[PDB]
Amino acid sequence: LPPGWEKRMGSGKIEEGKLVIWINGDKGYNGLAEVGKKFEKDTGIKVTVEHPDKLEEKFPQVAATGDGPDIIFWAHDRFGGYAQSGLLAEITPDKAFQDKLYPFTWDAVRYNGKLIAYPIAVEALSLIYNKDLLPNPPKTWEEIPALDKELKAKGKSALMFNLQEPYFTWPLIAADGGYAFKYENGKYDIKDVGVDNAGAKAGLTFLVDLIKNKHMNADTDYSIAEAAFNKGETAMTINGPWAWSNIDTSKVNYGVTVLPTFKGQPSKPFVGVLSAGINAASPNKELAKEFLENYLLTDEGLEAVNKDKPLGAVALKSYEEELAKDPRIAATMENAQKGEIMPNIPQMSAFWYAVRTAVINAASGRQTVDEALKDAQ
Numbered sequence: 001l002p003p004g005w006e007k008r009m010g011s012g013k014i015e016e017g018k019l020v021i022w023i024n025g026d027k028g029y030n031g032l033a034e035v036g037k038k039f040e041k042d043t044g045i046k047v048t049v050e051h052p053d054k055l056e057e058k059f060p061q062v063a064a065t066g067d068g069p070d071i072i073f074w075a076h077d078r079f080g081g082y083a084q085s086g087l088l089a090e091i092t093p094d095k096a097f098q099d100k101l102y103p104f105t106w107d108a109v110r111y112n113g114k115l116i117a118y119p120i121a122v123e124a125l126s127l128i129y130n131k132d133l134l135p136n137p138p139k140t141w142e143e144i145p146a147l148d149k150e151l152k153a154k155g156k157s158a159l160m161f162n163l164q165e166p167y168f169t170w171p172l173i174a175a176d177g178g179y180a181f182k183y184e185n186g187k188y189d190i191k192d193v194g195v196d197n198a199g200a201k202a203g204l205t206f207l208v209d210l211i212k213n214k215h216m217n218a219d220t221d222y223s224i225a226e227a228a229f230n231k232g233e234t235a236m237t238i239n240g241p242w243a244w245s246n247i248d249t250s251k252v253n254y255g256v257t258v259l260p261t262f263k264g265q266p267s268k269p270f271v272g273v274l275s276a277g278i279n280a281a282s283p284n285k286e287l288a289k290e291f292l293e294n295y296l297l298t299d300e301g302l303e304a305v306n307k308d309k310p311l312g313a314v315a316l317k318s319y320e321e322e323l324a325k326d327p328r329i330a331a332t333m334e335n336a337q338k339g340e341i342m343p344n345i346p347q348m349s350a351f352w353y354a355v356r357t358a359v360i361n362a363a364s365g366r367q368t369v370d371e372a373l374k375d376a377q
């Protein structure tokens with residue numbers, strides 16, 4: 001199980017009197033660092049924002065040995081698993097603080113009756129399109145192939161998104177009836193990975209058909225997708241609010257809109273709530289609580305992070321109402337509403353690993369759409 005246990009053995013594990021915060025590379029870590037500086041000026045407490053690669057997997061490795069950051073940022077879906085491993089301190093906001101956030105966001109970070117993290121923003125994938133190449137985006141997945149060959153004559157592609165992470169292809173898979181775990185009447189039934197049904201099958205086959213007919217390459221990743229769109233080579237892409245910042249600086253005239261339908265049914269992106277949890281091994285819990293409640297989760301705090309990279313629909317009511325006017329955010333919520341909030345059950349990491357492989361192989365010439373979808377059942 002453990003990696004890197006030997007190195008840190010005698011090094012003072014999590015430093016006292018300091019704050020170490022981890023957050024994914026695609027998020028506004030400089031904006032967060034600004035809140036840190038505001039925190040440093042008021043308290044003398046030094047804040048250090050880092051963005052390690054493979055964050056979602058590096059944290060459970062180091063935290064299991066009493067290591068890592070005081071504060072861990074990630075979508076809520078992996079927090080129940082962190083909680084079951086005893087990596088998270090329980091958080092104690094009072095009622096007056098909880099009322100400042102949307103109740104549905106606290107539910108996303110509630111595991112076994114306990115609040116295990118602070119909600120920050122609601123994330124959902126949307127269709128992002130180049131208006132100069134495509135003033136009106138297609139409403140259906142089915143009209144993409146015809147659109148793509150049309151654009152091919154001009155040396156442009158129709159659609160390019162990250163095919164390595166199942167997060168980006170999940171809304172296709174779930175549009176017709178695919179699902180992770182049955183949620184019947186309050187609690188999830190793990191004994192039916194609904195990733196096997198016809199609805200799921202029909203979704204991935206189309207993606208596989210899109211690569212069979214050369215409309216998409218199966219080796220396309222986040223960096224390749226972002227580059228093709230931001231330079232102006234592809235007309236559409238699929239991404240979250242965090243990506244808007246790099247697109248903004250590329251001067252592609254872009255719009256953010258509802259994901260394409262499939263079989264007359266909307267794509268259902270897996271909705272993620274960006275959350276901040278406190279390491280169980282942190283000797284700075286009160287400092288972390290003070291930082292999170294009175295510095296980050298304020299209008300000034302969220303604005304700083306947002307200006308760097310858009311968080312989407314923030315969990316804090318007061319700062320939200322100022323953002324709702326942004327149609328890109330409206331589009332995010334529209335897609336979120338058509339999708340479903342990810343569960344936080346510990347099985348999710350297992351789910352994600354399976355589907356990921358189940359998607360890569362089926363999209364490639366290594367396994368079929370069943371030697372991958374049964375391989376993940």
Ligand SMILES: OC[C@H]1O[C@H](O[C@H]2[C@H](O)[C@@H](O)[C@@H](O)O[C@@H]2CO)[C@H](O)[C@@H](O)[C@@H]1O
Pocket residue numbers: 024026056075076077078123165166167168272352
């Ligand atoms: O691809 C599986 C992956 O999906 C989600 O990860 C998202 C994350 O929520 C977003 O904030 C953004 O960083 O894109 C990620 C996909 O690369 C799940 O949250 C994650 O647990 C899961 O592994």
